[PDB]
Design a protein around this ligand. Structure first.
Ligand code: HEM
Ligand code: HEM
Ligand code: 2SN
Ligand code: 2SN
Ligand code: H4B
Ligand code: H4B
Ligand code: CL
Ligand code: CL
Lengths: 362, 362
């Protein structure tokens, strides 16, 4: 059963992959070797070209991603050679450095050894390589509430945050054969942060808001032709609304809209004043302005939507079915001002793709 | 087959309806009479209580409606007695008057005779009883483009618009037995209009924007226990975003965002300035302010969402399944600032309900 699913996913992937690479004639022989390799070993190993292209296809198939136009320029780092926690750590440090690229963000994925018998070689606990801790204790809310459980897990392992609203969580991952994960503090020189200012409201800096430059999702599983890369952190650059409309605005996150309303000089008393909507816009303008000012890559949601339209058009020209999750593709501000809002999308799941997996903590 | 579907829908409706009315014991006898009435006549007639409650249930089941909290206070006007186009016209004029209620809008439905053999007694052509005409001719865009086809249909019947951006379309409907519909100009004294001004931007009036007070959907079919009320115009009051974020903002409607950006003193050159988002907010503030200032009922989307949350809670307390269309329930501005955005809904279709039907024109 195991070696049957694998073989089926493998046949489908290699055919489609090699077809796109213009290697359709090499399929039959590559499929022969794979069939033999599965029978004998219970698995198979991707060539560098397959792995690289598989990661790109997986991005292209991510229904919830608005940034998919640039799927083919993904920078793929092959780290299937890693065997030690020192190597994992340095691969993670390197990923951060090369993706950040002094602010000129390179979309990048580092790929670690895949599961074998469903047994993980490396198990990364971070949701993102760079994220802020969160504390909920006795009425005191500090930091990012989304990070409360992971934070408490780290602190259970000997780490201690300074309890500012922006403590950088340590990298934390577990190697096959260890009962506990290990954790390593992040070198500050590797992490770019953007203080949030407003282009024309000077008081906005009184909020003392900031965010990190690069969102590096590190807890999703990459699936390519039956092979499960459970550890494969990837990053793009932020769309402004992710920070301005959700991370800093959600009541269950940093919940900053009342303070934004105050510094921008408007009352926050009446729903009919639309003070939340107005606060949202100024905060989102502030986020875009601040990232641009520091030279850190970011895209506004209109530009991103225009890009996604091109992705839609390219999909049709290439004869590929387009798949998408309308509920995630629409931006959380002014969605009706994008074309996305006014059409529908097929939410079917196509592989290769990125998937959720269970949290080891919690 | 016909008298079978009818009987089945009837059994389900009467049971549920009488149960909610506390008349569960009268069910068996009422069901007996209905069964006899169907066999002999090919149909059956709702009592006033059934019709009234059916219309309320249909509102309650409208997955796309955020205003459903007030389902039980719907004012139901029974006009199944109408036989002439003069009576239809006066019933439509009356509906407008009583729903408007000097600005203190009463949610209201006027119910006309139902289809018999699928044959319509009355066929209303308007999408809303009060709407603006639209003209598309030789580069010239005038009025509401959503009304272009109906407008051209009216003008094909002898009506002529003045070709302002806000020509009121005539009422237009067809009686069973006539090849053509008839049309009647709307008395201006019956129609409340709201000039759009801004609470603190005086130049906003230079736009010369306005809208009508009461949205009265007149082209949907009401289905109650197998009986098809194809003509049953209903109204609530507007949610501000319907006017500010869609009717006046959509590129395929009045497309006013550039002119809004100009009068509010901001540039409309860069996506990163979020000028559309900012323009949207000021226009939507202007809409709410203007309706409030004239004493015409309106609800902002935050208040409406809070009300819908209560509807959700009442549904659970009453033991009723909740159904909803997430894609329509989320407001087109700041959707993430509402609870609706952060939960999901079952989009199943429950009857009684309101349904689309084919346009006789176009
Ligand atoms: C290049 C810049 C990129 C931008 C601007 C972008 C934009 C976005 C946004 C806005 C979301 C929604 C996230 C949320 O609502 O929290 C998203 C989701 C997603 N993106 Fe991208 N993205 C980019 C690059 C990438 C890359 C490089 C990958 C992987 C190779 C990727 C895969 C995904 C996936 C898998 C999701 C959905 C995650 C989930 O279901 O939770 N994206 N993207
Ligand atoms: C009391 C005030 C009401 C408010 C504020 C309200 C609000 C809304 C809104 C905002 C929509 C979405 C419309 C759009 O996006 O264009 C909607 C849809 C709808 N509402 Fe309501 N509504 C109200 C009363 C009513 C009443 C009285 C009925 C009927 C008895 C009704 C039935 C519906 C239906 C059927 C739809 C969906 C129509 C479609 O699919 O095109 N609503 N409502
Ligand atoms: C934590 N998950 C189980 C749920 C969840 C909640 C909130 C956000 C996400 N994914 C965010 C996400 C994922 C991939 C991204 C890629 C690029 C980018 N700019 N943002 C991205 C953002 C996922
Ligand atoms: C014209 N239809 C085929 C599609 C369509 C497009 C745009 C809007 C609608 N329905 C709008 C609608 C329907 C019922 C409403 C009830 C109350 C209210 N305030 N707005 C309401 C608005 C329907
Ligand atoms: C329940 C709700 O549909 C769901 O949580 C979604 C809605 N759309 C979203 N869209 C984005 N981009 N991100 C999110 O976290 C969500 N939340
Ligand atoms: C295609 C798209 O999903 C669809 O046209 C919907 C989206 N959500 C909407 N929501 C509302 N309230 N009104 C609309 O007309 C639409 N359009
Ligand atoms: Cl994030
Ligand atoms: Cl409308």
């Amino acid at each position: 059963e195991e070696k049957e699913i694998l073989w089926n996913e493998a046949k489908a992937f290699i055919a489609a992959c090699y077809q796109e690479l213009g290697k359709a004639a090499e399929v039959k022989d590559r499929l022969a070797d794979i069939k033999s390799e599965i029978d004998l070993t219970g698995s198979y190993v991707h060539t560098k070209e397959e792995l690289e292209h598989g990661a790109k296809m997986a991005w292209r198939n991510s229904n919830r991603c608005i940034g998919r136009l640039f799927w083919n320029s993904l920078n793929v780092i092959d780290r299937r050679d890693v065997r030690t926690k020192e190597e994992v750590r340095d691969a993670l440090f390197h990923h951060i450095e090369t993706a950040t690229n002094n602010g000129k963000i390179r979309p990048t994925i580092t790929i670690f050894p895949p599961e074998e018998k469903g047994e993980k070689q490396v198990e990364i606990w971070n949701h993102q390589l760079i994220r802020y801790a969160g504390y909920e204790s006795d009425g005191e809310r500090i930091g990012d509430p989304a990070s409360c459980s992971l934070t408490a897990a780290c602190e259970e392992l000997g780490w201690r945050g300074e309890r500012t609203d922006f403590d950088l969580l340590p990298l934390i991952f577990r190697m096959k054969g260890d009962e506990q994960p290990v954790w390593y503090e992040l070198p500050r020189s590797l992490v770019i942060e953007v203080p949030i200012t407003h282009p024309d409201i000077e008081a906005f800096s009184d909020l003392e808001l900031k965010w990190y430059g690069v969102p590096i999702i590190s807890d999703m599983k990459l699936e390519v032709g039956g092979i499960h890369y459970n550890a494969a952190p990837f990053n793009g650059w932020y769309m402004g609304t992710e920070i301005g409309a959700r991370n800093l605005a959600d009541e269950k996150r940093y919940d900053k809209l009342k303070k934004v309303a105050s510094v921008i000089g408007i009352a926050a008393d009446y729903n009919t004043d639309l003070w939340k909507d107005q606060a949202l816009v100024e905060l989102n303008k502030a986020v875009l302005h601040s990232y641009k000012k520091q030279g850190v890559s970011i895209v506004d949601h209109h530009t991103a939507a225009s890009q996604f339209k091109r992705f839609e058009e390219q999909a049709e020209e290439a004869g590929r079915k387009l798949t998408g999750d309308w509920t995630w593709l629409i931006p959380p501000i002014s969605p009706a001002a994008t074309h996305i809002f006014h059409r529908s999308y097929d939410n079917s799941i196509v592989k290769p793709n990125y998937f959720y997996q269970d949290k080891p903590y919690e």
